[model samples]
Target: YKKPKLLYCSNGGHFLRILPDGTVDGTRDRSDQHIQLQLSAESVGEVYIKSTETGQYLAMDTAGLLYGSQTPNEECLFLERLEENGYNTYISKKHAEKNWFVGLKKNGSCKRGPRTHYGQKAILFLPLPVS
Candidate 1:
């Protein structure tokens, strides 16, 4: 896509953001550039998420922890599934069998991917562009 967007999650009404350094978090600042992320269209239903500001890719480990990786590996890949209500769900391409999600808590904390599911609000995100 051309313009970068903020991945807004319904759980906390927060935007999925990568912090200053390499840390990733959920933020409520709609106009914050730190939250602006680029969605890379690698293939059909397959995407890689990268920070527009930090130059890092979002990755998940077998531990289900979500973080920023400087290198693009298999863990950096995600299956971007647009689900109910035009919301999108990202499942780990590396942990496809385990079905890990890019999740966030209601209080803007991180949620381990293995602990999340498809129907959860934390797993659903709406990509909103800068207006």
Candidate 2:
């Protein structure tokens, strides 16, 4: 099987990376935070995402807030829904929230919100460039 990968937001034009201090944001640079990540499964379906940079998992809280956690739980898991476009959709697994997706705001900050319907601005997930 192929190795796990980092994710890039097609709309944001930035790689989904976690800062050393545990801040989750998107960046154009492929740094340590943008390296290998562990997905729960190989197929393009629901899965958990863990960052190799900090050994923390991606999770959503009660208020749809995304955060990194050292101890991975069910909340840390997400559904990798393949979209009609080449990119994939990351839906939060918590409560089976259908519309909620991982997206970035205008300020380059990450947030969980209803998927962008028109241009699909922030919900598209592209594979990180091979390096």
Candidate 3:
């Protein structure tokens, strides 16, 4: 089930993406392959949000900052869970105790992990399929 998707932040209306330069952010444009990501499984209900184009994984810093890396570590493990609104939230699995969710700002920028929490509009995303 390695389908490509655009992890769209419904609040900011942008696709979550990891740039080739290793920047973590969101983009309103669907014009490039950089926006395509795959939810590759790690364990039961755990996934690695990896780039389908650049082959990097989405990683979050221990201090709640987001980044991208070619080599994955525990930071790449995300708990992909659903919410009441049918959207999904990707929380750091290893840092589940901290409740750090993968969230974006209302302006399409990556939100600091510590500032993100459950059921927040900024943390909700739709896994829109690309293929």
Candidate 4:
């Protein structure tokens, strides 16, 4: 809902970080490597999440893998929705499958699926200076 913020994983207790090679993962400690993203919009509901460190945008492949891309495309656009529990859920805009959410996998990679429940590795949003 804000411009600058951290996408925190409630199950992993880490922030969604993008590696130098554009790999997306979770990091428990807040460091320079932690992926910091800026939320902006070109349209009303379409949001573009750009990485503050790499200057790239977050993109999810059709296979549900998450990565960073230099160019902004339809695949990189998302719909940010605020849940009643206080976490922001991001849905892929270009995905053919409906309700594909940006969530965390057990292997530490960012994924796309319908994981609305909080405790089951659901993605949670946190503000900057996350404690």
Candidate 5:
């Protein structure tokens, strides 16, 4: 697939509405949003996606998987409605202030964490291009 344009979207909540132009704003946090935050905030974890010129977001993989850096690989993961099996984890103690980037992980990769941290269920916003 031809790499269209890489975007860096920061600032936003888990459930709020965000402008489709990619302007950083905070409003809501969805399952994918929470995963994006979790994946981006972690030192060991790294996340990125290949979005089209029109804004079709496609996730790159790590060694035939997502959210892993040990081995790098490109894939169409991180997409909602196409994923089913994966972990379900969430964290809040390591929150980001302003200028924070929350990346929605591909669907169904969140892991269930113990009660000591943010639960497994998270809110996510599926990526839609501006046509």
Candidate 6:
């Protein structure tokens, strides 16, 4: 029920996960290409919405919280972002087993999505277990 803060390196080399209270959870690396963030599990049928062209936006869960692979057809947890050309982020329902996978439709065109973005950056958040 709170907003998560997302942090990025000055050079845009990496993105850091910041808790609501302003703590660093971790970082997701995006030093390559072929990764992006989405709210839903590609295995379960998740899309970047915009980039999908109202079609299926393929993504690999970089979080490794659930099922992840270089291929998008896999199950994933923690609502991961796409981390390749750059790290893309997303926001999903917290603590719940399932939630709406919301993604931003930048520039009103999914086709011209992060694929061409300077950095495929976006932030989708799942709660960090209160250990």
lDDT of each: 0.86, 0.70, 0.88, 0.71, 0.26, 0.29
- Quality of model 6 by C-alpha lDDT: 0.29
Candidate that would win on lDDT: 3
Question: Can you tell me which runs of candidate 2 are displaced by over 4 Å?
Answer: 32-35, 42-44, 114-119, 129-131
**What TM-scores do the predictions have?**
0.94, 0.82, 0.95, 0.81, 0.21, 0.20
Q: Write the per-residue lDDT of candidate 3 for residues 31-109, one digit (tens) a residue.
A: 8779999888878879999888899999998889899999999889999898888999988887888999999898988
Cα lDDT of candidate 2 equals 0.70
Q: lDDT (0-100) at residue 45 of candidate 1? A: 86
Model 4, residue pairs in steric clash: none
lDDT of 5 by residue, 7-35 (tens): 22221223222233432222333322312
What does the lDDT come to for candidate 4? 0.71
Tens digit of per-residue lDDT, candidate 1, span 54-115: 87899998889988998788889999987859998999998888888998899998889779
Candidate structures ordered by lDDT, highest first: 3, 1, 4, 2, 6, 5
The TM-score of candidate 6 is 0.20
Q: Which candidate tops TM-score?
A: 3
Candidate 2 or 4, higher TM-score? 2
lDDT of 1 at 38: 89
lDDT of 5 at 12: 29
The runs of at least 3 residues in candidate 3 whose Cα sits more than 4 Å from the true structure, single-residue gaps closed, are none
Candidate closer to the true structure by TM-score (higher is better), 3 or 5:
3
Tell me model 3's lDDT, rounded to 2 decimals: 0.88
Instruction: List where candidate 6 sits over 4 angstroms from the true fold.
Output: 1-31, 34-45, 48-67, 70-131
Greater TM-score among 3 and 4 belongs to 3
Each model's Cα RMSD: 1.2, 2.6, 1.0, 2.9, 13.1, 15.3
Where model 1 places Cα greater than 4 Å from the true spot, the runs are: none
Tens digit per residue, CA lDDT, model 6, 82-118 = 5554433443323224332323232211212222223
Per-residue CA lDDT of candidate 2, range 9-104, in tens? Answer: 876677777665656777777665444576776345778777776788877776777777888787787878777777887777774645668776
